[PDB]
Amino acid sequence: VDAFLGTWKLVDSKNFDDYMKSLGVGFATRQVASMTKPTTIIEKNGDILTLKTHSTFKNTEISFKLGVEFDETTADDRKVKSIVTLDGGKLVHLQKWDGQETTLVRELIDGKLILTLTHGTAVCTRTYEKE
Numbered sequence: 001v002d003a004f005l006g007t008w009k010l011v012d013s014k015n016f017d018d019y020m021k022s023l024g025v026g027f028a029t030r031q032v033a034s035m036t037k038p039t040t041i042i043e044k045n046g047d048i049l050t051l052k053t054h055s056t057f058k059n060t061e062i063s064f065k066l067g068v069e070f071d072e073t074t075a076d077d078r079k080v081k082s083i084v085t086l087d088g089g090k091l092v093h094l095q096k097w098d099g100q101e102t103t104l105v106r107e108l109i110d111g112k113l114i115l116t117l118t119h120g121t122a123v124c125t126r127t128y129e130k131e
């Protein structure tokens with residue numbers, strides 16, 4: 001886990017709109033979201049991880065232990081059952097609600113943090129660089 005810790009800022013995004021539309025997010029929120037550049041902060045205290053996502057539009061914060069399910073309310077106001085684990089060096093966050101699922105996978109490549117989000121047929125890639 002140690003290599004993911006720190007402060008990261010978004011520098012590229014591909015197909016976020018398709019991902020948001022798949023989840024049912026409405027047009028007006030997709031407009032603002034397409035022009036937002038979040039800051040993600042990942043920290044650890046023993047076996048507890050804290051992931052903060054900050055922006056001018058919305059802010060989220062979750063705390064969890066790897067491998068242990070938790071309740072989460074997402075930026076889009078879904079109430080989901082989540083679990084985060086380490087799989088081949090990637091941090092894999094799975095969300096489930098009403099029979100559906102989406103995955104948020106984080107990998108380090110060349111010192112950047114790549115976040116891939118998949119729901120349905122839509123796949124979005126977002127690139128973050130370390131601050």
Ligand SMILES: CCCCCCCC/C=C\CCCCCCCC(=O)O
Nearest residue numbers: 025033038053055058059060075076
């Ligand atoms: C908290 C910052 C979110 C910015 C706009 C999001 C508004 C809601 C729409 C879809 C939410 C999808 C779930 C979270 C995606 C987070 C993306 C990321 O961390 O870059």
